[PDB]
Protein backbone atom coordinates (compact mmCIF):
# COMPACT_ATOMS: atom_id res chain seq x y z
CA UNK A 1 0.00 0.00 0.00
CA UNK A 2 1.36 3.38 -1.11
CA UNK A 3 0.19 6.62 0.51
CA UNK A 4 2.37 9.06 -1.45
CA UNK A 5 -0.67 10.89 -2.82
CA UNK A 6 -2.40 11.38 0.53
CA UNK A 7 0.98 12.19 2.09
CA UNK A 8 1.18 14.94 -0.52
CA UNK A 9 -2.28 16.16 0.54
CA UNK A 10 -1.38 16.22 4.23
CA UNK A 11 1.82 18.18 3.68
CA UNK A 12 0.27 20.51 1.12
CA UNK A 13 -2.34 21.38 3.74
CA UNK A 14 0.46 21.91 6.26
CA UNK A 15 2.45 24.22 3.96
CA UNK A 16 -0.66 26.27 3.24
CA UNK A 17 -1.48 26.84 6.91
CA UNK A 18 2.17 27.54 7.74
CA UNK A 19 2.51 30.29 5.13
CA UNK A 20 -0.82 31.66 6.38
CA UNK A 21 0.80 31.68 9.82
CA UNK A 22 3.44 33.95 8.24
CA UNK A 23 0.93 36.57 7.06
CA UNK A 24 -0.14 39.34 9.47
CA UNK A 25 -2.92 38.10 11.78
CA UNK A 26 -5.08 41.16 11.08
CA UNK A 27 -5.14 40.60 7.31
CA UNK A 28 -8.79 39.96 6.31
CA UNK A 29 -7.73 37.69 3.44
CA UNK A 30 -5.84 35.42 5.84
CA UNK A 31 -8.82 35.03 8.18
CA UNK A 32 -11.15 34.66 5.21
CA UNK A 33 -8.93 32.16 3.41
CA UNK A 34 -8.47 29.96 6.49
CA UNK A 35 -12.20 29.72 7.09
CA UNK A 36 -12.58 28.28 3.59
CA UNK A 37 -9.98 25.63 4.40
CA UNK A 38 -11.65 24.72 7.70
CA UNK A 39 -14.96 24.50 5.82
CA UNK A 40 -13.54 22.45 2.95
CA UNK A 41 -11.91 19.84 5.19
CA UNK A 42 -15.10 19.69 7.26
CA UNK A 43 -17.15 19.16 4.09
CA UNK A 44 -14.86 16.38 2.85
CA UNK A 45 -15.22 14.64 6.22
CA UNK A 46 -11.51 14.81 7.04
CA UNK A 47 -12.56 16.76 10.14
CA UNK A 48 -15.26 15.06 12.19
CA UNK A 49 -15.84 18.36 14.01
CA UNK A 50 -15.06 22.00 13.29
CA UNK A 51 -11.50 22.82 14.31
CA UNK A 52 -8.92 25.60 14.43
CA UNK A 53 -5.73 26.08 12.43
CA UNK A 54 -3.24 24.37 14.73
CA UNK A 55 -5.73 21.50 14.84
CA UNK A 56 -5.58 21.28 11.04
CA UNK A 57 -1.80 21.02 11.40
CA UNK A 58 -2.03 17.82 13.47
CA UNK A 59 -5.56 16.46 12.90
CA UNK A 60 -4.97 15.98 9.17
CA UNK A 61 -3.41 12.57 8.57
CA UNK A 62 -3.32 9.80 5.99
CA UNK A 63 -5.70 7.67 8.06
CA UNK A 64 -8.37 10.39 8.00
CA UNK A 65 -8.37 10.46 4.20
CA UNK A 66 -8.41 6.66 3.99
CA UNK A 67 -11.32 6.53 6.44
CA UNK A 68 -13.26 8.65 3.95
CA UNK A 69 -12.58 6.18 1.14
CA UNK A 70 -15.70 4.41 -0.07
CA UNK A 71 -14.20 0.90 0.50
CA UNK A 72 -13.54 1.89 4.10
CA UNK A 73 -16.87 3.62 4.71
CA UNK A 74 -19.12 0.74 3.69
CA UNK A 75 -17.10 -1.44 6.07
CA UNK A 76 -18.01 0.91 8.92
CA UNK A 77 -21.62 0.78 7.68
CA UNK A 78 -21.33 -3.06 7.84
CA UNK A 79 -22.23 -3.40 4.15
CA UNK A 80 -19.17 -5.61 3.61
CA UNK A 81 -17.36 -7.71 6.20
CA UNK A 82 -13.91 -7.06 4.73
CA UNK A 83 -12.28 -4.24 2.81
CA UNK A 84 -10.99 -6.32 -0.10
CA UNK A 85 -14.49 -7.75 -0.28
CA UNK A 86 -15.87 -4.20 -0.16
CA UNK A 87 -13.57 -3.29 -3.06
CA UNK A 88 -15.22 -6.18 -4.92
CA UNK A 89 -18.84 -4.97 -4.81
CA UNK A 90 -17.90 -1.45 -5.84
CA UNK A 91 -15.88 -2.98 -8.66
CA UNK A 92 -18.86 -5.34 -9.07
CA UNK A 93 -21.12 -2.30 -9.37
CA UNK A 94 -23.67 -3.03 -6.64
CA UNK A 95 -23.10 0.26 -4.75
CA UNK A 96 -24.61 3.71 -5.33
CA UNK A 97 -23.81 6.99 -3.58
CA UNK A 98 -26.77 9.27 -4.17
CA UNK A 99 -28.30 9.10 -7.67
CA UNK A 100 -24.96 8.05 -9.23
CA UNK A 101 -23.23 4.69 -8.92
CA UNK A 102 -19.49 4.70 -8.25
CA UNK A 103 -17.36 1.87 -9.63
CA UNK A 104 -14.05 3.38 -8.46
CA UNK A 105 -12.73 2.22 -5.06
CA UNK A 106 -10.45 5.25 -4.75
CA UNK A 107 -13.45 7.60 -4.37
CA UNK A 108 -13.85 9.08 -0.88
CA UNK A 109 -17.32 10.13 0.19
CA UNK A 110 -17.94 13.57 1.65
CA UNK A 111 -19.74 14.03 4.96
CA UNK A 112 -23.02 14.89 3.22
CA UNK A 113 -22.77 12.02 0.74
CA UNK A 114 -21.47 9.70 3.53
CA UNK A 115 -24.99 8.47 4.19
CA UNK A 116 -26.68 8.26 0.80
CA UNK A 117 -24.47 5.26 -0.01
CA UNK A 118 -26.54 2.11 -0.56
CA UNK A 119 -26.91 -0.70 -3.05
CA UNK A 120 -28.31 -0.20 -6.52
CA UNK A 121 -31.98 -1.10 -6.63
CA UNK A 122 -31.75 -4.16 -8.92
CA UNK A 123 -28.62 -5.58 -7.27
CA UNK A 124 -28.91 -9.29 -6.57
CA UNK A 125 -26.96 -8.50 -3.39
CA UNK A 126 -29.95 -6.50 -2.10
CA UNK A 127 -32.45 -9.26 -2.91
CA UNK A 128 -30.57 -11.72 -0.70
CA UNK A 129 -31.07 -9.22 2.14
CA UNK A 130 -34.83 -8.85 1.79
CA UNK A 131 -35.31 -12.55 1.03
CA UNK A 132 -33.94 -13.58 4.43
CA UNK A 133 -36.04 -10.93 6.17
CA UNK A 134 -38.90 -12.17 3.95
CA UNK A 135 -39.58 -8.52 3.11
CA UNK A 136 -38.76 -8.90 -0.60
CA UNK A 137 -41.33 -6.86 -2.53
CA UNK A 138 -41.14 -7.66 -6.23
CA UNK A 139 -43.02 -4.45 -7.06
CA UNK A 140 -40.15 -2.24 -5.91
CA UNK A 141 -37.94 -4.57 -8.00
CA UNK A 142 -36.12 -5.25 -4.76
Amino acid sequence: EDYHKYNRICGDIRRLANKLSLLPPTDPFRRKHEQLLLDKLYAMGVLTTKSKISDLENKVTVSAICRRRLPVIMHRLKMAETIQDAVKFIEQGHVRVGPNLINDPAYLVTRNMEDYVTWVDNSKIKKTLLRYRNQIDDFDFS
Partner: peptide
Protein backbone atom coordinates in the same frame (compact mmCIF):
# COMPACT_ATOMS: atom_id res chain seq x y z
CA UNK B 1 -20.22 0.66 -21.58
CA UNK B 2 -17.31 2.58 -20.12
CA UNK B 3 -13.80 1.44 -21.03
CA UNK B 4 -13.12 0.99 -17.31
CA UNK B 5 -16.46 -0.77 -16.79
CA UNK B 6 -16.00 -4.51 -16.24
CA UNK B 7 -19.64 -5.22 -17.21
CA UNK B 8 -22.01 -5.33 -20.14
CA UNK B 9 -23.91 -2.13 -20.86
CA UNK B 10 -27.22 -4.00 -20.76
CA UNK B 11 -26.60 -5.08 -17.15
CA UNK B 12 -25.26 -1.62 -16.27
CA UNK B 13 -27.57 0.56 -14.15
CA UNK B 14 -25.29 3.61 -14.33
CA UNK B 15 -27.77 5.98 -15.97
CA UNK B 16 -31.18 4.72 -17.05
CA UNK B 17 -32.95 7.81 -15.65
CA UNK B 18 -33.20 11.40 -16.86
CA UNK B 19 -31.65 14.08 -14.66
Amino acid sequence: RFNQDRFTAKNSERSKFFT
